[PDB]
Amino acid sequence: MEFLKRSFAPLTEKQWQEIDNRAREIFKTQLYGRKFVDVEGPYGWEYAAHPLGEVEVLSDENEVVKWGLRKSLPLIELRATFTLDLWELDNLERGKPNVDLSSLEETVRKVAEFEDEVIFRGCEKSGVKGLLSFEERKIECGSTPKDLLEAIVRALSIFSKDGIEGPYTLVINTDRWINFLKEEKRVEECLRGGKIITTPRIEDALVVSERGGDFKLILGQDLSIGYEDREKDAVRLFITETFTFQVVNPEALILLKF
Amino acid sequence: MEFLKRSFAPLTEKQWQEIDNRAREIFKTQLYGRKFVDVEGPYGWEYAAHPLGEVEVLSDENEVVKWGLRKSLPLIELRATFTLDLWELDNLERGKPNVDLSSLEETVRKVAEFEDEVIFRGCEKSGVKGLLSFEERKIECGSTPKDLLEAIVRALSIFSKDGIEGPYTLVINTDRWINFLKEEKRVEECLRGGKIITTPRIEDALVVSERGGDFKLILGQDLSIGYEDREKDAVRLFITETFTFQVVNPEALILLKF
Amino acid sequence: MEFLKRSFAPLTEKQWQEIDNRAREIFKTQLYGRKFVDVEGPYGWEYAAHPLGEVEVLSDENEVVKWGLRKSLPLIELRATFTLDLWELDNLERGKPNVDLSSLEETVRKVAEFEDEVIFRGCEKSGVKGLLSFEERKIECGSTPKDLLEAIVRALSIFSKDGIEGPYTLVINTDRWINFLKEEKRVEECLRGGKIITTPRIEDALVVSERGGDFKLILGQDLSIGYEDREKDAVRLFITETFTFQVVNPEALILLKF
Ligand SMILES: Cc1cc2nc3c(=O)[nH]c(=O)nc-3n(C[C@H](O)[C@H](O)[C@H](O)CO)c2cc1C
Numbered sequence: 001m002e003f004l005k006r007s008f009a010p011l012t013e014k015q016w017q018e019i020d021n022r023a024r025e026i027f028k029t030q031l032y033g034r035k036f037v038d039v040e041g042p043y044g045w046e047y048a049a050h051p052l053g054e055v056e057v058l059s060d061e062n063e064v065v066k067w068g069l070r071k072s073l074p075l076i077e078l079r080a081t082f083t084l085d086l087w088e089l090d091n092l093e094r095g096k097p098n099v100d101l102s103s104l105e106e107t108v109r110k111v112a113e114f115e116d117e118v119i120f121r122g123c124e125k126s127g128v129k130g131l132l133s134f135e136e137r138k139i140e141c142g143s144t145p146k147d148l149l150e151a152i153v154r155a156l157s158i159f160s161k162d163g164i165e166g167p168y169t170l171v172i173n174t175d176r177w178i179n180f181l182k183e184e185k186r187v188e189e190c191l192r193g194g195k196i197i198t199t200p201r202i203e204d205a206l207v208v209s210e211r212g213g214d215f216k217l218i219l220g221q222d223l224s225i226g227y228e229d230r231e232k233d234a235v236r237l238f239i240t241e242t243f244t245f246q247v248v249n250p251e252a253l254i255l256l257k258f
Numbered sequence: 259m260e261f262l263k264r265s266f267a268p269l270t271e272k273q274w275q276e277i278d279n280r281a282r283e284i285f286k287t288q289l290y291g292r293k294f295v296d297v298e299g300p301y302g303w304e305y306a307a308h309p310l311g312e313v314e315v316l317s318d319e320n321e322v323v324k325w326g327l328r329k330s331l332p333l334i335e336l337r338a339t340f341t342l343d344l345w346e347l348d349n350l351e352r353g354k355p356n357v358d359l360s361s362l363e364e365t366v367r368k369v370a371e372f373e374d375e376v377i378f379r380g381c382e383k384s385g386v387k388g389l390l391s392f393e394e395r396k397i398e399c400g401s402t403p404k405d406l407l408e409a410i411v412r413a414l415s416i417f418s419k420d421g422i423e424g425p426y427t428l429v430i431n432t433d434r435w436i437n438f439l440k441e442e443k444r445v446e447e448c449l450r451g452g453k454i455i456t457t458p459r460i461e462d463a464l465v466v467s468e469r470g471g472d473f474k475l476i477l478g479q480d481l482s483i484g485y486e487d488r489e490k491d492a493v494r495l496f497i498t499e500t501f502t503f504q505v506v507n508p509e510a511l512i513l514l515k516f
Numbered sequence: 517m518e519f520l521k522r523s524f525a526p527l528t529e530k531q532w533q534e535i536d537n538r539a540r541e542i543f544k545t546q547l548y549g550r551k552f553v554d555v556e557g558p559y560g561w562e563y564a565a566h567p568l569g570e571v572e573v574l575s576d577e578n579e580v581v582k583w584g585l586r587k588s589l590p591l592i593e594l595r596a597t598f599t600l601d602l603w604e605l606d607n608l609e610r611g612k613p614n615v616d617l618s619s620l621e622e623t624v625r626k627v628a629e630f631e632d633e634v635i636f637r638g639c640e641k642s643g644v645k646g647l648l649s650f651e652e653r654k655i656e657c658g659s660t661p662k663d664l665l666e667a668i669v670r671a672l673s674i675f676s677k678d679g680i681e682g683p684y685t686l687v688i689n690t691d692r693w694i695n696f697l698k699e700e701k702r703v704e705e706c707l708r709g710g711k712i713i714t715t716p717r718i719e720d721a722l723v724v725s726e727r728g729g730d731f732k733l734i735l736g737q738d739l740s741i742g743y744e745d746r747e748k749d750a751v752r753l754f755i756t757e758t759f760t761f762q763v764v765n766p767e768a769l770i771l772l773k774f
């Protein structure tokens with residue numbers, strides 16, 4: 001909307017359109033957490049807090065009127081800036097097919113780690129708890145290709161004592177996955193037809209259920225690009241967003257110690 | 259709605275209808291603050307916080323990604339209980355026209371002071387500031403019937419240096435008003451045709467403008483009555499509500515020191 | 517119109533609309549002269565002089581061809597600048613209801629004295645004469661509440677020896693009006709049903725007739741706001757206007773000496 005002052009920057013339609021496509025491609029492969037959690041739809045640029053449904057009592061013991069306060073979670077807002085070069089950007093109109101956009105890509109890669117760190121390890125100043133802190137759901141595994149199958153078979157018998165079902169997914173580390181490569185068809189069918197995700201963000205493995213409604217991400221505004229000011233022969237732009245995160249049912253998650 | 263468990267109490271329609279009318283009459287004359295402020299419509303039993311439109315920065319000085327948190331005001335919830343007598347309540351069906359309801363009236367009178375205290379003096383634990391703490395809007399007055407007219411004429415020349423207009427109202431203490439009784443027609447027309455409100459809640463006088471949009475009260479749920487449990491030969495009931503308060507433009511208010 | 521370069525400033529529609537309303541309110545109460553004089557409609561941004569209907573002869577005494585020049589009044593143009601803060605202005609989109617606009621109000625108050633000074637005391641370099649320089653229309657008054665009524669009754673017998681009639685108005689000083697407060701209904705009906713105006717711009721009183729067509733103010737362009745240039749993190753704006761003033765019939769004015 002209008003709060004991103006896009007019409008006041010000296011660029012053309014083709015130049016604006018060439019900048020969005022490059023960032024949309026990297027955001028699609030570098031956001032690992034968004035592949036197995038739920039997303040609650042956007043509320044707007046004015047939303048500020050999300051309700052927790054409880055009261056805390058502050059009055060004394062022997063009083064006629066008694067009172068307290070309600071509870072909530074506050075959202076987080078971010079902002080990051082970069083700069084580009086005008087004479088280099090202007091060859092697109094003469095007809096050059098490969099213009100150099102190298103400052104955009106480093107910033108796009110650094111913004112993507114900030115969100116995954118909050119999802120996997122919490123914040124401690126906004127009141128958020130991450131996935132790797134629930135230490136009461138753990139089983140010890142070994143380091144031979146048979147132990148992987150044995151641990152996967154043992155993990156589905158704990159989901160049964162509760163009423164948990166649905167498709168199941170494996171999330172594992174990319175250096176560990178190299179030494180288990182000979183057994184790939186066996187795992188997929190022992191998982192009853194699930195899927196595997198490799199990532200550099202953790203050091204061990206975890207198993208989750210995907211029936212729906214256990215891990216949610218709340219958004220106010222999605223990721224956006226805007227204009228700030230002009231310099232000698234460069235231009236200055238920024239990226240922004242607002243969000244928060246929550247875990248509801250901790251019985252759909254299991255950690256593998258290795 | 260259903261969260262007040264009214265259908266599970268052993269009473270009839272006439273008995274329920276006779277209890278609401280008595281409280282509705284006292285609430286209409288004992289709520290003094292609601293006669294010159296604005297009321298924002300009810301949102302519901304789940305509303306929890308109201309937005310302040312600002313951000314607070316928490317990151318360090320030299321970083322690539324910078325962040326902060328948004329700001330809000332939390333609401334207040336109250337609850338008060340009382341008890342009544344069944345054999346006495348049952349004479350309404352035999353045809354008695356004056357049944358004794360004496361425990362209801364003390365509780366109704368004590369709930370009404372709690373709200374006026376917040377409006378006139380703040381809370382200090384929810385982050386609320388009341389009307390009598392803005393000390394930069396004050397003028398000294400005297401104690402002779404001419405000084406009242408002189409101070410009222412002086413107070414309308416300060417409203418003019420800003421763009422403030424509209425009808426004006428006087429709020430004064432009831433023991434002070436006794437000694438100014440001979441001049442009543444003069445005040446009403448010197449006020450350009452305003453109105454006067456006497457109250458036991460303060461000790462001096464104040465003047466306010468009533469053009470609209472300067473002092474607001476935000477409600478989640480209005481004042482309601484519900485049922486709790488049964489005892490030997492009595493029944494137990496309660497009253498409840500949720501709210502908060504704000505002052506926007508401090509240039510529509512003036513205090514008279516006397 | 518287009519000579520105010522409004523489209524080149526980095527603001528939104530709501531931000532522009534919030535700035536006009538605040539100035540429109542103060543201009544409505546701080547322009548005292550415009551309450552009893554006439555206004556001749558606007559001519560445009562190119563108007564330059566207004567005709568006086570006379571000729572001045574410059575040739576010699578014994579010549580066959582004789583000649584001279586015509587006479588006029590030139591208009592006055594003004595300009596005043598101020599600056600504002602962008603991050604503070606940007607909270608209106610997050611939802612803040614009271615944004616601080618403190619530099620605008622001082623400039624608006626200082627522009628309003630400049631016009632009243634010309635109307636009440638003349639210019640001496642454009643050829644303008646003000647209301648307080650016609651010294652042949654004066655009567656001496658006293659300082660007791662009866663002398664006010666006596667002087668008002670005497671002043672209406674001078675309007676009768678000429679053919680002057682119509683409603684009559686009193687313009688008086690605000691510290692003097694305090695000591696005459698007990699007689700207010702008497703004055704209004706002795707004035708035959710007129711009106712009273714209090715002001716801090718003079719030191720005595722005057723009486724004028726309001727039949728129409730004796731004191732006129734000529735405008736080229738009304739009061740307007742425009743954009744100049746951008747700074748580090750602020751923006752710079754200005755206010756402008758063009759006008760002149762004239763008195764036609766000096767027999768509709770009387771001064772009270774006190
Ligand atoms: C032939 C020629 C073409 C140029 N084209 C551009 C251009 O497309 N964009 C640009 O910013 N500067 C261009 N410049 C340079 C630019 O005019 C100048 O060096 C700086 O903008 C400072 O005046 C060009 C210079 C020359 C000699």
Ligand SMILES: Cc1cc2nc3c(=O)[nH]c(=O)nc-3n(C[C@H](O)[C@H](O)[C@H](O)CO)c2cc1C
Nearest residue numbers: 343344345346347348349350351352490491492
């Ligand atoms: C003639 C009579 C009428 C009564 N009516 C009522 C009544 O309307 N409501 C009531 O709670 N108790 C009533 N009681 C008393 C009640 O039955 C009893 O004392 C207590 O409820 C304990 O059993 C009545 C008792 C008598 C003797």
Ligand SMILES: Cc1cc2nc3c(=O)[nH]c(=O)nc-3n(C[C@H](O)[C@H](O)[C@H](O)CO)c2cc1C
Nearest residue numbers: 077078079228313315324325326602603606749
């Ligand atoms: C979270 C955050 C939000 C900001 N929002 C704004 C803004 O709305 N307008 C603004 O001019 N500057 C804003 N700034 C600061 C701005 O980017 C920077 O300090 C100066 O504009 C110089 O780069 C913000 C900074 C942070 C950290």
